Amino acid sequence: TSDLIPAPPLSKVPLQQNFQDNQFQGKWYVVGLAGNAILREDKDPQKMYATIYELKEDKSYNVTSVLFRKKKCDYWIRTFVPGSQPGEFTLGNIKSYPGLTSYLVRVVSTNYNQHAMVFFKKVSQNREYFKITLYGRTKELTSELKENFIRFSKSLGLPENHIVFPVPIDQCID
Numbered sequence: 426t427s428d429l430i431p432a433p434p435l436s437k438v439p440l441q442q443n444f445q446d447n448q449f450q451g452k453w454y455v456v457g458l459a460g461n462a463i464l465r466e467d468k469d470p471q472k473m474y475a476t477i478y479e480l481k482e483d484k485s486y487n488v489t490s491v492l493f494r495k496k497k498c499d500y501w502i503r504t505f506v507p508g509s510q511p512g513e514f515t516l517g518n519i520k521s522y523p524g525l526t527s528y529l530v531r532v533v534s535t536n537y538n539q540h541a542m543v544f545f546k547k548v549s550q551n552r553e554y555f556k557i558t559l560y561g562r563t564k565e566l567t568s569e570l571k572e573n574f575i576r577f578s579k580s581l582g583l584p585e586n587h588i589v590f591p592v593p594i595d596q597c598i599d
């Protein structure tokens with residue numbers, strides 16, 4: 426049993442015009458995170474983590490997320506393969522994730538050198554999940570950018586308790 430806010434139609438999710446794959450590379454901090462399986466937890470608030478994008482020769486990204494958990498740095502590695510238009514991706518080797526039948530990434534907006542918003546949708550054990558990340562090249566972003574992220578998240582049907590701003594840390598992600 427679970428109950429989820431439905432994924433929005435893709436028509437409600439903009440795509441960054443003229444996406445530049447080379448400029449999107451490098452480290453991004455997760456300054457904001459929202460989704461139908463994301464919940465604000467005041468007892469142990471979510472810690473900031475980072476995601477590093479590297480273009481391979483074949484123009485897919487190697488994507489590495491690094492998180493501080495149980496006193497250690499944990500690394501999650503995957504491959505984003507260019508999809509139907511620039512700024513969209515599917516997940517490489519999807520078969521090695523049990524139960525995962527669908528995975529889509531769309532870069533919603535970015536100026537490359539400070540901030541981005543990225544939309545993700547997956548189907549896992551037949552359940553449809555989605556999330557939006559607010560990425561920063563630094564660990565803080567302006568109020569304006571955070572409010573825009575909240576506005577965008579709500580437009581996709583998410584209430585405030587499904588929107589979190591992970592707390593900056595120094596372990597692992599420096």
Ligand SMILES: COC(=O)[C@H](COC=O)NC(=O)c1cccc(O)c1O
Binds near residue numbers: 463545547556
């Ligand atoms: C069982 O709960 C989950 O499935 C987790 C929740 O935490 C996400 O960081 N993932 C997602 O909700 C999710 C959604 C879209 C794309 C992804 O890669 C995700 O991990």
Ligand SMILES: [Pu+4]
């Ligand atoms: Pu995931």
